[PDB]
């Protein structure tokens with residue numbers, strides 16, 4: 001029932017993602033000189049260095065907010081790919097399955113800790 005435990009769990013999961021070869025295209029913002037039509041397709045860029053910096057700054061309030069920004073990395077790759085058989089999109093699907101497998105217990109534990117805190121609210125003092 002530790003309400004704060006999610007933060008270190010997300011730092012460790014981000015460490016595993018940065019060691020995965022499949023994350024290399026997603027570690028830093030897309031290079032607009034290499035992909036000049038990227039911002040004609042994609043409204044909101046996102047990358048794993050931005051996610052880690054936001055976490056380490058203390059600018060996520062919950063693991064649900066981190067999970068929304070990681071899912072945006074994957075939805076941007078699906079929107080920019082010219083083919084569902086492309087190299088970089090194929091890497092995004094494998095990394096998305098690994099992330100979803102690991103984030104599910106982080107989210108469940110956080111939500112369980114908040115419910116336990118609300119069961120024990122103090123009203124008489």
Ligand SMILES: CNC(=O)c1cnn(C)c1Cl
Nearest residue numbers: 025077080081086088089
């Ligand atoms: C992070 N880069 C991308 O998602 C990207 C670049 N090129 N293609 C085909 C994709 Cl998909």
